[PDB]
Amino acid sequence: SLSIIDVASDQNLFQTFIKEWRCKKRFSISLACEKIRDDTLVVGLAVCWGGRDAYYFSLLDPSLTLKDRMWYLQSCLRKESDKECSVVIYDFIQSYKILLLSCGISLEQSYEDPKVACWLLDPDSQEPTLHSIVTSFLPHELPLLEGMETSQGIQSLGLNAGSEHSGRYRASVESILIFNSMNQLNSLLQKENLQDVFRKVEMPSQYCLALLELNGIGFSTAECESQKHIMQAKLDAIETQAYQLAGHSFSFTSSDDIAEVLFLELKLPPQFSTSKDVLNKLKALHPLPGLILEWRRITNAITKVVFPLQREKCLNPFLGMERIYPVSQSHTATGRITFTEPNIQNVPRDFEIKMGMPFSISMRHAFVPFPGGSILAADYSQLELRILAHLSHDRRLIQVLNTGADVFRSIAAEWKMIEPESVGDDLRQQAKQICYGIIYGMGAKSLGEQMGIKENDAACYIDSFKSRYTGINQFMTETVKNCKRDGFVQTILGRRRYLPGIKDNNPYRKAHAERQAINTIVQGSAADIVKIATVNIQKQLETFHSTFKSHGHREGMLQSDCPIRGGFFILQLHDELLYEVAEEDVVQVAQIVKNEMESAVKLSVKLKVKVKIGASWGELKDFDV
Template identity: 35%
Template sequence: MRIVKSKTEKTPDFHCNNIGIVGMYFSTENEILHCCLRSSKCICIDAVKSIFQSQHITIVGFDLPWQLKLLYQCCHISPECNLWDISVADWLLNPRDEKSSLKQMSKEHLSSEDMSRANLQKTQCATDTALIWVLKQKLNLKLLENNLLDPFVETEMPVRLLLVYMELSGMPLDQNVATQLWNRVRETMTQLEEQIYVKAKRRFSLSSRKDLKKVKESLNIKPDDTQNPFLVNIHNWRKLGSLKTRNLSPLLMTPLTDGRCRGQSCSFTVTGRIVMHEPNLQHIPRDFTINHEVFSLRSAFVAKSGNVIISADYSQLELRILAHFSEDPDLLRSFQNEADVFVSIAAKWNNIPLEQVTEDIRHQTKQIIYGIIYGMGDRALGEALGVDPPEAAMLASKFRQSYPGVQRFIENCIADCRKQGFITTLTGRVRRLKGINSPDKSLKAQAERQAVNSTIQGSAADIAKSATVRIEKRLRTLIPKRSPVLSPLSASHLILHLHDELMYEVSKEHVEIVKNVVKIEMSNAVLLKVPLPVVVKCGPSWGELKKV
């Protein structure tokens, strides 16, 4: 299937935001069908609706999400049929941070004979449609050969449709609250600038490390004196500057016609994590305080009247995956009680009682654990801990010695990757790492870190996606006449996929149903050797969520 869109002054009947659908091409094994949709009176529209609403039909396409979004916006059609996206299949076979073009995929997967047959069509759209049909047959076989068809059908394709609906639903944004925050940020930055320049006795670029170094030397401020009031002001100014330029500016520049902000999601990443852009709603910072004044951009995301926001967040998901894979007895035991897991781990590897674990020791333990998970080198870990690289290496080594199962997992993960050339996540997805056997020590070390990181982070992505699909299926069963996209008459919908956290906007009448569903389905998305607890919060806005 391929949609033909038009962007002209004379828009067709099926249009939205000056972009319209003027036709669609469908391919079967023996023929190409063209449906003209320039007029709403055309009989083709009924045929198109019946195709997409049949549960016995599979629609095959290339980069389906934007076409499905356009189909909903222009024709109010939401698919009930099965969906098969060749770009998702191609990515699943060889994950990377961008999708291949149809031309690239044809060169990689098709023979010259296959391409010649497709090129016999009269138009480029018909040729593309023929290529899509042939590619589906080839990619389906490759998914089967690599044991990837189940994750493709059960998780990857359903989650693509859910992300389309999430983008169409959008996040509720009160631009008045955001504008007020912008003004407060600008005023506070101006005040901080004045204080900084008075102390420095001259003006300089506050964002320049070089200039700051010269000023620190002139004021005899030691490099490690992070609590110095002058450096605190610099830090606060930069923090506010980041909030202003990275978050507030994109949000306030985004035109909102209905009070909802719609980011674009992308699932084509090497780890399988879902990321966002234009604007990136996953990068909205947590609330922070400067001089006793709270700066909360999250409080600008306010649920519509009669609705609330529900957040469901996995607790230490990646650490639990590490425990599952490593099967380290002591690490597994840390998750069998209600105590703070980082305190338990800190006490174990520092060989001290639980009550002697300070906040600094807990924080250091957390940094080391996530340093291992994220594949940090000694230098990066040292910067995170505030120590030099040799000490960081010593602390990480001491941690691994306390949990030998973790070290064995790391070694086995790297060894398997060297042998196979790829890593495998919990659901069987792969990531190929070319540098794992490189003679270049730097490339090899990077690939070894990526092997561990991708196994854990990729598995976390698998779990979050699976949970999203499970929740949607359950809500459709429990809430009758639920529309696929959030509307004033229907609200129990995903509005943000925040890696290990899912956010829903829910009408007050459905709060109890949704709270129970997200907790049960997320906790049971996969079976691990440790529990998968979920923290559920609820509130009128993102910034006012309270644990329930």
Template identity: 30%
Template sequence: MAEKNKTPLVALVDGSNYIYRAFYALPLLTNSKGFPTNAIYGFTNMLLKLKRELQPDYIVVTFDLKGPTTRHGEFEDYKATRKPMPDDLIPQVPFIKDVVRGFSICVLEKQGIEADDLIGTITVLANEKGWRTAIISGDKDLMQLVGENVTMIDTMRDKTYDAAAVKEKFGVGPDKVVEILGLMGDTSDNIPGVPGIGPKTAQRLIEEYGSVEEVIKNSENLRNVKLRESFRQYAEQARLSRQLANIRKDVEIDFDIRDAAVRVPDKEVLSKLFSEFEFSSLLQEIKQDKAKPAKEYKQILDRKSLDELVSHLKKSHEISLEVIFEKNPPTDLVGIALSEGKDAFYIPIGHTNVLEQLPVKEVFSALAPVLSSPGIKKYVYDLKTTLVSLDGFEVQSGEDLLLAAYLLNPAKNSYNLDEVVWEYLHERIPAPNDVAGGKGKTYPLALVPLDKMTGYAGQRADAIDELAPVITAQLKKIDAIELFRKVEMPLLHVLSEMEKKGVLVDTSLLQQMSADLTQLLSISEEKIHRLAGEKFNINSPKQLQNILFEKLKLPSGKKTKEGYSTDVDVLTDLARSHELPAEILAYRSLTKLKSTYVDALPALINPKTGRIHTSYNQTVTATGRLSSSNPNLQNIPIRTLEGKRIRQAFIADPDCFLISADYSQIELRVLAHLSEDKALIDAFASDEDIHTRTASDVFGVFPQMVNADMRRQAKVINFGILYGMSAFGLAKELGVSMKIAQEYIEGYFQRYKKIRIYLDGILEGARRDGFVCTLLNRRRYLPELKNKIPSVRQFAERMAINTPIQGTAADLIKVAMVNIANLFLKKKLSARLIMQVHDELVVEAPAEEKEEIIALVKKEMEEVIKLKVPLKVEIAFGKNWDEAH
């Protein structure tokens, strides 16, 4: 192996050049707050690559500062043709410099002096010491500095220029590059050169005469008449161009090259920056050494140790709890870690390779006085799943930091504990894959060796303990602590009880329905083949494209990598002119119902309870709405016959009824309250059909003259306004022209004037503050409002309009759920909430409690919060979910 050159190497980075190159090399990237990050990310990776591959002894990154330079004094139009810095790049520049400093790399910049001249000056300083210099840039001007100990590296093109490579590019050596540029000019810097002279002519002239000055002196001897005339007219311009292209090597700078020695990066600074910009891969790269020093965690393996632990914990004011369970199902417990700051403990209860461990029930029975004590605060991460896993054991005075992290930034895709700890504490803790596999291979946590699991669980419990005060302070800062403690935390307990209770399902009905759907799909398939004129694989996009666009010559829409799209939007448009796309949509709908619900529901039944235990997700939607999974109840069709039959499969216990309570037009009522529009308030106050009222106002007819189609269109308009729908979107939805759609919107706002004022105000406030809030102060950040990409910005505008309305509706039903569940317990009723879907609550109640529950639920939902309009709840009961509608 070749010995490393011991002569010190100085890396001089043309920072200004690389900022632009990094920006344009990557697509526009943003973090979850919408802040642009592509240039920061690209520049950072370049620095890491430079350090890794070059291993320099000294590094300097130079930047141009805003404002005129010495060259502007020589030539007013210097760089005049350069476009302004892109808006999405401007805010990234200061952070790029912060990243450079975070790497403990010297940043050099001087007002009025260009980065090139700083590089030229430092190159001379390095040469005087006999050191090697590597100039990191893609700027051809800097090739004039290349010499015996100086190279230029274009990392973007992976090209290194020594003297031979420069000569290959320009046809002359590095010392003559400035002469070439003086003649041919440089369009990037608006250096004019001599008109009519390009690279080849410039090379020939410099090869023959050696310099710009000598070419000018001998210009009358040039055989080319046009060239002679050019030099007569532009001799001074040639001299000026050479002067502008010449890099200075004598700039006065307060700089000691020894200060540029490579140093250890400031990982604290880099951690904060990379966390803010959500550079997970870069975080991973620097966090290898960031893990906290190993700490000894105590294992609790016998009853004596457990009793001592309980006695110790009873004296604590607060503890942190991390229950380790298999991902699926969470009832498969592995162990429990507890931390109270100084000490942390791990109790194995489900390890398959540990002989000495206590039984689950014995452990939790012993811990029960601590877990249920209201005087000891418990911090947990994902308390709802923890409660489900504990199966009956209470955790009182618990605070879920997962919920808190969600409220601080509800738009994130992931809230894994290790990621949140890194974001707020800049500390590394192990993720599940770190102890149970990785690289796509995982194995059960119960198989992890005890010592390894003890460290894993203990670190996580400690991290929760450290995270609690930090994240609580952030909640208080955005005034969300009341929402957290009075709405989301109580709701968490309600949801965990709903999940544990589950709902009964009629499997025989589902089996019959599966057979019926199989028959319907067969009929639909035959019809599709008949309409297509041939048999083909309906589920093959390529074959479907061929039928629709090649054979039937239907108009093709948006194109994807695989060809023309056949998604639902495209097929819906095509269905207006041909029967086949409509039938394909129906076929797809039936297929999805069969696979997602009819055939899947029986497999979700818990064999121990005979019920389906849906998971309710509290930290998924950015608006605050709940979602559900296994199964996803929200996606069961409401109006179709098949959707009704699926609902019929959700049944009550033999001696019970299902009671369905559904808010009527809650989002429009919230809009009336928030906008304070008198016309809308009056319509709800007089209990009018709001869609009929809107149709009457928009179409200019008496309410009694409104037909079904007019009401349907008015309904689309009403809800379109809620979702910030444009005239284009409304036209598409209603199948009318843009002009008519715009007239509908104008007619709507003419009638409901204060709604427009309210919506304009919401947008103005969102652009100013960067976020919107619900009535209960749930916050959603919308940095995309400042995005330069119209489609991204317009989406954010729609979210700014919709979130306060939809989010407030979500807040109301959450508060109602908490109140109702508390009343059931207070009154010692047997009824229980078992499902929540959109604006609907479903209760399972014994027959003898039915009337009381109907009255109680209706009252609590309608009186949950006093609005300027009455809240209305439609409530019914039945032996199955469909009957209860």
């Protein structure tokens, strides 16, 4: 029927409690809430290291101590020294978000997050939930959970459907279920040779990602609203530039209103459709296909961009600057990492614009460091290529790379016209796009499309590239055959993705899976290296500079009852590592970043790292030896 424990009886109860507690290695933790949403209103923590029994830590209802208990919890929760114990929670980053932000305890020890293990098993799985896990993992204990009906986030976040059961009940049941279960999961991971890869790599990723997600990132509405009115100007100005040719009752917003003049005065449609086809016109016809490019691009650049940023921005009182907070995601099929409150990964790239007298805009320039700071970006110069170079061992690429400076510049140099350089970056980026598209098996006719040429000509070009490098086709078809013999691919860490569709009869699921093996291995391992560089950098950053960790921890200083120095984790562009750093340590910071990104693990080629630096989000790069 019942077993739980309030840990308050005068003293002795609580005392033998911490006395046991301090000794234990593996243990589990969960909290709960009630109302009011940040929030500091949290009922109390709960802990269990095993068995049907569980311990609760309040904040019946007896008394002696007050601030005391919180101190004990602190002392218990961190790694004095040399004493290495681990701790588990359903999801992670937000529980640590609370412990730091709500009550001001910076938890530091070894960490184990089970939904991440569950994911590490099945990258294609959908977003594990409690009920799903205790179902798939802890059966004989399960039925009890069914008194509640919530599974998305933890039992604190499930506060509503739990509200009829809410209290210590939720924190405790989450604690114990999580403990037996995570014991089972860890059994499963060690049952493969993934455990070193789990505890000693990806949980640290969740960690680094977390103190980031606390860092947030800097923003200035003055810039946002500046380029805002810029864009409004080009909006209406292009409206009249358009209706100078005709105009007939027009507004761009409606595609059916567009059907009128488009289908009428021009007549070339190879609902109807819109975009690709009119780009096909943007090459050739001058009379306002590209007016539609600039207009449509503008609208996307405002409504799906300026609005949400100007919405869900917040401020740090501790800075005097406003910043915005993403969320750690992971759960990518490859193992790459994304962010959603907005996603600032896809934020628009700078582009030029017409009103000599030209102009240019950057939606992204509005991200600033703190007043004293500057932003450091460390980009991998063509990492995945190097990876494929390692696995195919194509010596030819190893040489074309170990020499070539942005080998895209060479590909461009021999392609649309011969120029040695003075290659515009719009072109450079188009080239990068076409090529990376090819490597994973771009379609022949579509290649003919992006370059603008005929089918068989483009196909003879692809065949030409198999001829140029066969180590690729070797590695390629071979790894396909392995995916049939096994049914999964494997990234270098030993993390592996299950491709079900590779064996399927339907030609499409089979084709898609063939390429999918390729991209999954290379992008997956790419993201792996990146994670490793992140945790390296941050772990060094941690003790090496004796100041402290990240922006949440200030707020932690106010609850635990100054100058600004360090550099802080901000973002990952998957090969790019994004830091803001005080303009002090920026050189030290830079050489550390270069160092740990190049020092992840050694392989067939050296990984050059271009490192850009400067005020705001648009920038310059140089450093010397």
